[PDB]
Ligand binder design. Sequence first.
Ligand SMILES: Cc1cc2nc3c(=O)[nH]c(=O)nc-3n(C[C@H](O)[C@H](O)[C@H](O)COP(=O)(O)OP(=O)(O)OC[C@H]3O[C@@H](n4cnc5c(N)ncnc54)[C@H](O)[C@@H]3O)c2cc1C
Ligand code: HEM
Ligand SMILES: CC(C)Oc1cccc(NC(=O)c2ccccc2I)c1
Ligand code: SF4
Ligand code: F3S
Ligand code: FES
Lengths: 250, 129, 616, 153
Amino acid sequence: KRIKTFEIYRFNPEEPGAKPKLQKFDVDLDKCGTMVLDALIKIKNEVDPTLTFRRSCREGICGSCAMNIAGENTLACICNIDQNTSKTTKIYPLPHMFVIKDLVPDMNLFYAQYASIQPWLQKKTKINLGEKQQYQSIKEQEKLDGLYECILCACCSASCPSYWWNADKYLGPAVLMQAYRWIIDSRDDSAAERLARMQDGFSAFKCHTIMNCTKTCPKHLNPARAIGEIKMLLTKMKTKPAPLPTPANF
Amino acid sequence: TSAAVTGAAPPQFDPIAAEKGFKPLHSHGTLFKIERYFAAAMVPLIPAAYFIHGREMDLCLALALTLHVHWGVWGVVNDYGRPFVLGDTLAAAVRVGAYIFTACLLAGLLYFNEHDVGLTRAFEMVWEL
Amino acid sequence: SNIAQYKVIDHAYDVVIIGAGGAGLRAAMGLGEAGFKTAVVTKMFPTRSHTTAAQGGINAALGSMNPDDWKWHFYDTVKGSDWLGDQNAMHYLTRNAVEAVTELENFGMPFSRTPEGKIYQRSFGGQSNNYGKGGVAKRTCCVADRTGHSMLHTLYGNSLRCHCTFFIEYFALDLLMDKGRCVGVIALCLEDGTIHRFRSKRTIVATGGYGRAYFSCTTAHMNTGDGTALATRAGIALEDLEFIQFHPTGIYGVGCLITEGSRGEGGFLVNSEGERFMERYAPKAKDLASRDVVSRAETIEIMEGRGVGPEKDHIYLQLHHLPAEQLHQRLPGISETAKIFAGVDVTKEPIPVIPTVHYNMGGIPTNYKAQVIKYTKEGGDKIVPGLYACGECACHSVHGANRLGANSLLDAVVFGRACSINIKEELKPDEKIPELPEGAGEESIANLDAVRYANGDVPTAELRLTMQKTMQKHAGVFRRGDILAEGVKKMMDLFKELKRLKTTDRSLIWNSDLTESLELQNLMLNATQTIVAAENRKESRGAHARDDFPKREDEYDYSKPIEGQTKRPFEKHWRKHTLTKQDPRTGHITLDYRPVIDKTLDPAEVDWIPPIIRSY
Amino acid sequence: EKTPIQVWGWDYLMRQRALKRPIAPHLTIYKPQMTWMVSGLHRVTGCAMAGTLLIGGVGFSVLPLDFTTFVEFIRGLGIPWVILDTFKFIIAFPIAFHTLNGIRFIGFDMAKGTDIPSIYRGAYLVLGLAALISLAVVVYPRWERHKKATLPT
Ligand SMILES: Cc1cc2nc3c(=O)[nH]c(=O)nc-3n(C[C@H](O)[C@H](O)[C@H](O)COP(=O)(O)OP(=O)(O)OC[C@H]3O[C@@H](n4cnc5c(N)ncnc54)[C@H](O)[C@@H]3O)c2cc1C
Ligand code: HEM
Ligand SMILES: CC(C)Oc1cccc(NC(=O)c2ccccc2I)c1
Ligand code: SF4
Ligand code: F3S
Ligand code: FES
């Protein structure tokens, strides 16, 4: 048998005087799926049902299982288990987030911030909600690629040392890329008002180009590039192009 | 058993309700831009001072480095002078201390260029060793 | 409630939605827009909902690629159902498609585009122009590979404007019933172990499906059929549960869905010969035949030794013959998923795939307005006051016996909206929030405690598995009356093993041992009802295929001409909805049967579609 | 003054405190990566330099000592020539690397060079050029001082 050993952060808020721990669990790799999630499940089901984590989609699309494996923030469900058994693989929750139990962090500041950007299409001319399609060219919509893929997993926000130290004022890479996904949407009018909401010295500008976000994102996306883009926009070094005009026959 | 107490709504940011009555404008934008333009300008200066020395370069190094390091430490200070970890008065004392650090820095350099060898010369004298 | 204390917490809402996927949210938006104090209860953050995992698209006759007609879509949808579909509801679904999907775009859903700037549409399974006479239709609006992801994130986004108040990671235990009327929901808050009773004039059930009833599925770990469990526990009979869709192309080893979009963009299935075998099983639509026909096609090829791989037990889905510019523009996610899970460069090798449990056309019965219904033989469709259901958890029935590809995201948005629309126009503000009856939810709490401290020999994960394993073997793609009977026999035994449950985690705060056990109970209800229904349906229709009854039994023989036949009575044919009534504690199920509604909503708008032979 | 969300955020931090919930480990556990190491370095150098200018400028002013009698004190020790030029190298590198990486980061501020290959190339290039310039500026004159000691007149 090939026995992999995991070091898995524990915390029980129920118990009095309780302090975080690290617990070793041995997993027979031959009786277990390829992915780190698989091990956690195996361990929960066969060894310790009190082991507590988030999951849904088994394919890397929900973002619920985001955690810190092997030092980096990734999704457990598409992280291959490290086959070499002389290593112990370490599993902590998303760094610098308040925890509830084990690998489940309080995710609500994250969410509130994503509400703050107003993640929905705005138009300065009231539209008849069902009636016809907004024009947008291919080129225009292709600006949304690498931006709309974000699954809200928080891996990157929780890898940003600035968002560690100032989660309360600096929005962080996840929420900021999404703020930018609605800014450069040609179908959206309110670019100016969106930028007004993060003018101050913390909201956007506490990005100190550390780059751990674009690195760690398990979806192969780039927030540091999007933020950079916001800085240019926020300092008038650039502007949003106006929407390509909606052709007569449409 | 179900003998119970009326609940309340869970805390939750209402982005529209928050929007009513907050308009405020303080663009850090134009301030950020110049901090960078200034660092870009210092790129020539740093080697300019490798080659050309004197009491006049000592002065421009002393002025650029005072102003750049002012904005430097200020940041570092806002990044770690956090009220959650320090509580406001003590953390506003770190904010203020970023300015004392700027003013002592200059004072010290000016002195050093006026009643001592100067920056460029001081560098020469360690490189001669 | 015996052996512990529980903080109960009471709330008063106009309408309470259990669910925050497609259906759930679209309903919430319309309600909050129309003014209502709306509360949304969901056991996971709404973006993690299974809707986010959807891929291929959402159907509407936008005509962005070629002229189109919602009546053609209507047609294809009914032919889809193998005439188990309620045509009034299938009418509402398709009439309102163009508008529903336009809204999504008007909300900022970032659809892929045509050169003209319009919403891009791809081809898909079981669709056609001119009422089946024309070609392979292009109705399936897609955001590339990840249509479900984009749609849900958009709805969620726009649900922050509607002032709808969210309760995130609350596990719904039961409906709060007061003499046949629903006055709310009771749930467990995971963050603190508090128990919550929501009083509300309405309750919309939008909880998704029950894929995890089986060993292998494309569904998420959270597809546990809670909403159906809830209804079953409120004494509501569930409809059509035996109709379980096997998506033709889930990845062999892992169940991860590979989209039908990948065929409708030009991919095909291939056997061990190298043959493109779907040209035999369905000459007209080839690899875009309906889901039940394709899956069965593969399943035979496996049986008859044309399987592929080491053990010859899956087939290949081939895409490498397509341009890479098209493979990345149209199938980027499954490009990546096939890499991660099957080791497959999709532009050079084929993907190992195999039919896989995917959708649940069955569920909570409703009328065209999505109002839950109970059925008597002699009184008929009697609506349950206060309760509504939509999305996978419902059986409207818009899918009957076979769900069409890209019709569910549609059903969720359309009938989700329909809930808000139908409630605005039936709920007036003289009526106040229902006062709870005394002892409301006391039993639901009793179950919690019981499961929470459960003692017995058999742990909760062991039982789930043998549920899942049993079900995979006995209620599969091809079924027989003896296998099924033996499968009921085993399932009803597993229901009894529930009393010997072991749990281990004793906490109230974020206890996944506990909630997964609640989920297991819920899954048993669905699985037991699913199989007895399946065991008794002595015919073959849609997904449900009996080897030992391979004909589709309708009122007439629709393969002879019709004039000069005599209508078989209700009791002797099978063109009816199966109804399953389970005593939750004993587990005993009794069947009943309910006529299929054939009228459209308005004959001056569209003519009902008579049954024929289903030939793709 | 704060945005509304930043108000919310602080109120959030207050609950998190009051619930005596722990903070998930971070620097102790996060993998070393060229992304952040180098940021760390850029600040560490940036700061050290300022600190030297302050302890220097102000130090020599508030002391009876001056810079000339300091350079004799150390010379007096007559420490080996390799050690000295290493201390020189140590002085050059902060100035070089920070100056270089300073421009790098200004790219990152402008969305430029932000993909992972650019991030890693950028990193190495800037560590290289800085070390090269630091090794040149130390050695080159010391090399000319050996040419002086032993050449033809
Ligand atoms: C892999 C995959 C791909 C698909 N692709 C497509 C496609 O391309 N096109 C298409 O039309 N259809 C597709 N479908 C079908 C379609 O996506 C689903 O039928 C649809 O997403 C269902 O939406 P829903 O809101 O009814 O439920 P879901 O999206 O399943 O959401 C269920 C919600 O109910 C909540 N819930 C469940 N139990 C409880 C409880 N006890 N308490 C509180 N809340 C609870 C959950 O928290 C969740 O928020 C796909 C399905 C799968 C599995
Ligand atoms: C010669 C060209 C230089 C350039 C282009 C430059 C550029 C920059 C930039 C862009 C930052 C911001 C980094 C961030 O936000 O993370 C910065 C920070 C800083 N710089 Fe420089 N710099 C130069 C030289 C110097 C010098 C000579 C000193 C000497 C003391 C210095 C001290 C600092 C300090 C203290 C900071 C603090 C902020 C931080 O690390 O976050 N810099 N510099
Ligand atoms: C342990 C690593 C991953 O993380 C850490 C830990 C401590 C400090 C830092 N780095 C900063 O704090 C930092 C550095 C440069 C610019 C802005 C910052 I906010 C990173
Ligand atoms: S960006 Fe990459 S990492 Fe950050 S949230 Fe979106 S997906 Fe998760
Ligand atoms: S990790 Fe943090 S500071 Fe900027 S580029 Fe990345 S967000
Ligand atoms: S469980 Fe969905 S991202 Fe891993």
